[PDB]
Ligand binder design. Structure first.
Ligand SMILES: [K+]
Ligand SMILES: [K+]
Ligand SMILES: [K+]
Ligand SMILES: [Mg+2]
Ligand SMILES: [Mg+2]
Ligand SMILES: [Mg+2]
Ligand SMILES: [Mg+2]
Ligand SMILES: [Mg+2]
Ligand SMILES: [Mg+2]
Ligand SMILES: [Mg+2]
Ligand SMILES: [Mg+2]
Ligand SMILES: [Mg+2]
Ligand SMILES: [Mg+2]
Ligand SMILES: [Mg+2]
Ligand SMILES: [Mg+2]
Lengths: 122, 113, 79, 98
RNA sequence: AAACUCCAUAUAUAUAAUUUUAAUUAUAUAUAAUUUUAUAUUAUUUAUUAAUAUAAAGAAAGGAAUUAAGACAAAUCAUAAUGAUCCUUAUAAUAUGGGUAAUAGACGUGCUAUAAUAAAAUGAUAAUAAAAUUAUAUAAAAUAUAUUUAAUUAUAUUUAAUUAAUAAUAUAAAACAUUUUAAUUUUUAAUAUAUUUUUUUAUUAUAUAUUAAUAUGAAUUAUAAUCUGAAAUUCGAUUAUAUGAAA
RNA sequence: UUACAGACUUAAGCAGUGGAGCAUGUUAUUUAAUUCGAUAAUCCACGACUAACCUUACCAUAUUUUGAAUAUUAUAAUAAUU
């Protein structure tokens, strides 16, 4: 009942940050090592600066690396306090803040999205 | 400008220390010269060949640099560099294995019965 | 004990100069096998700190240079 | 056991020929084992991971629009300036030319 | 915190075209106990009760994990990380060889042994396991040598199958049966003898030494060969012949 | 400082330790170095789930000097942009 329903228990697969099984144990060790390194790299991409006195620090959780047979999904939770334009206006609808620029290079950027670089690493 | 090893090598992507660099260099050069060492070992151990050719191969084998020796590769912890009690299933020392295991970093590792 | 079928542990050494000039052969190759040619030649064998001078006889063939250059000092207690 | 050895040797030789196997009736050490062992170089040389990983220094050219800050590097540079102000800086390194 | 729990155990359902076979199994789910019931006795705070026994029902008998606080300013700066302080042609870096294996005494922890409620051989339609391992491999059978009919053990040659509920490491071992076993004249042998015959009895010979070390024990050492490795000298492992200490 | 309770202990039982040889750790001493800890309970097959080289942290000799990092500023070789 509790463990037989997806809404009443946490799948044990979620207890691990790298969710993978490879018959080739060496490739599994490599994927595990790659997930720690990318997690460290992403932690270094969360601190952004617009001007000397405007440094926006995005707080990122550890990554959840879902390794399926055909793809790898890197899921993470992030918190950002928008302190530059926290108004009641719609001025944010006419420019991309630094956090939107950072999130748009993950998948949207057509030339240098981080997914394509990682797709060759993995 | 002055690389410490005779041949230029790329750096490991993670934790780095002098001992890791020395071990990694030996690993790369072992791969480049593995076939050469096997071919010389064959000539030196093939009793069908004349003794002179066998002794020539043995002499060439003794003159190879130490960084081409398979027996000098030592498994080290990829996170700390410690070379004692390194588990080959994760390439981590016992202490780093325990820390990673409890953090959920090892794919299927949980606490025993 | 190296297998006899493998042959001697031959190391690069300057034997020609020591046979045409008589100069001593300074070497750190303590594993080297004393070949029958070496007989009569003079060797200076490293022991970790110094080079021990030793001349090779016919009863030394087959042994290894390291066997004739002790690396430790005899033990003594402060009785 | 009663089968003559000559007959059993003829079967061994022909069988080895069909199956592309090395027939060494005498038993001389040939080194064939060395020629058959697998190459472990690729596995050994990947122990520490793939070296071609994206690094923080490559981010300033991949994404010119975004300005990233390396807090670890920044912390180190601040500790260097602090030691210079206390007079505990590092001695100038001697030049080989000297 | 206890517990709830998970594990084990018992049972049910599902899955397997029962040749990946162990269906006597595998692993998902669920159930079960913190056992229950009556009866007599003995105490009680005697009541809607405990301690016992007794009959009845049941497979039911065992474990786990984690922490609440505080102390030893107990261990670790040598798993990695931080401050301060020191080195910066050196206290950083690389190579060759050596050392970490030295040896008077002392201490901790182990192994083997000092023989008969106990050691050694042999046991092929192959007595009887579990849990693990094998792509930086596990290595079958066979053949050759040690080596003898063969087996056994060791190595070489060759490299079958299996990257695995499939094949391999790997015919578990003790057990049990038979034989043998110094000290031991408790033996062995030669004759004769028997209704104990794998044996009894008789008469001869079978040692002397001996509080002691044997056919116990396997340290030490000589020589030859082998295995891994590029390399076995300081300083590795194995085998054969010989050596055979202490106890 | 009192009383009670609790274990702690003791007893019983089996096999050992303490004696011999060897393995191993430590001490001490030695050594060019015999790397360094840990070192009553709570060290002593402990760190160490394997020290011939490597490992390695020690010693001798020889050798390297912006070194494995980041950034700055020059110089070039190369590809794009313009
Ligand atoms: K050594
Ligand atoms: K016995
Ligand atoms: K040796
Ligand atoms: Mg090794
Ligand atoms: Mg069946
Ligand atoms: Mg030691
Ligand atoms: Mg015995
Ligand atoms: Mg059987
Ligand atoms: Mg076989
Ligand atoms: Mg049997
Ligand atoms: Mg037996
Ligand atoms: Mg005996
Ligand atoms: Mg005695
Ligand atoms: Mg060295
Ligand atoms: Mg060493």
């Amino acid at each position: 009942g509790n463990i037989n329903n997806k809404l009443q228990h946490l799948n044990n697969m979620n207890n691990w940050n790298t969710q993978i099984y490879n018959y080739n144990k060496n490739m599994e060790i490599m994927n595990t090592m790659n997930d720690k390194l990318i997690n460290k790299l992403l932690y270094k991409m969360m601190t952004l600066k617009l001007n000397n006195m405007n440094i926006n620090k995005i707080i990122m959780s550890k990554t959840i690396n879902q390794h399926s047979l055909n793809k790898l999904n890197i899921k993470f939770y992030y918190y950002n306090n928008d302190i530059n334009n926290n108004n009641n206006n719609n001025n944010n609808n006419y420019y991309m803040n630094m956090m939107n620029k950072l999130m748009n290079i993950m998948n949207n950027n057509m030339n240098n999205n981080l997914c394509n670089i990682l797709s060759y690493y993995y | 400008g002055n690389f410490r090893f005779p041949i230029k090598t790329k750096l490991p992507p993670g934790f780095i220390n002098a001992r890791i660099l020395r071990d990694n260099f030996k690993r790369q050069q072992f791969k480049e010269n593995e076939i050469l060492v096997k071919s010389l070992k064959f000539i030196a151990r093939n009793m069908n060949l004349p003794t002179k050719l066998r002794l020539e191969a043995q002499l060439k084998l003794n003159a190879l640099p130490n960084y081409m020796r398979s027996t000098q590769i030592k498994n080290r912890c990829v996170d700390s560099g410690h070379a004692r009690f390194v588990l080959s299933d994760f390439r981590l020392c016992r202490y780093q294995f325990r820390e990673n295991a409890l953090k959920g970093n090892l794919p299927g590792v949980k606490k025993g019965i | 004990s190296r297998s006899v079928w493998k042959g001697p542990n031959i190391v690069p050494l300057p034997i020609r100069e020591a046979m045409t000039k008589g100069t001593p052969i300074r070497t750190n190759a303590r594993a080297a096998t004393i070949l029958p040619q070496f007989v009569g030649l003079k060797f200076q064998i490293h022991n970790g700190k110094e080079y021990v001078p030793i001349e090779i006889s016919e009863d030394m063939v087959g042994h290894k240079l390291g066997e004739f250059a002790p690396t430790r000092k005899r033990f003594s207690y402060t009785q | 056991m009663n089968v003559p050895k000559a007959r059993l040797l003829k079967v061994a030789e022909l069988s080895a020929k069909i199956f592309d196997q090395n027939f060494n009736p005498s038993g001389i050490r040939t080194g064939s084992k060395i020629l058959n062992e697998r190459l472990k170089g690729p596995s050994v040389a990947s122990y520490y991971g793939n070296p071609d990983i994206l690094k923080f220094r490559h981010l300033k050219t991949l994404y010119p629009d975004i300005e990233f800050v390396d807090l670890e590097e920044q912390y180190r540079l601040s500790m260097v300036e602090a030691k210079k102000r206390r007079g505990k800086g590092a001695p100038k390194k001697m030049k080989k030319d000297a």
